Design a binder for this molecule. Sequence first.
Ligand SMILES: [Ca+2]
Ligand SMILES: [Ca+2]
Length: 82
Amino acid sequence: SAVDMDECKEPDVCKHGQCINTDGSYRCECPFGYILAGNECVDTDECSVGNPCGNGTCKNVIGGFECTCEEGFEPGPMMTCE
Ligand SMILES: [Ca+2]
Ligand SMILES: [Ca+2]
């Protein structure tokens, strides 16, 4: 039928990312929290910036990051210390 080659659904193009099938091309636009390594889309290292916990330590996670404030507190999923 001529299925416009997805290009992004290929195992060597996007891979875990939001793409947009164009005429004869594509665009691997990763979500908010991910990135692109030449094609493979995945999560980045948010802990690479600064301990988001505010004082504890940063950790890398998906859709955000993980952090362990000064033992004795209660962190969260991928937001910050609280
Ligand atoms: Ca296409
Ligand atoms: Ca991350």
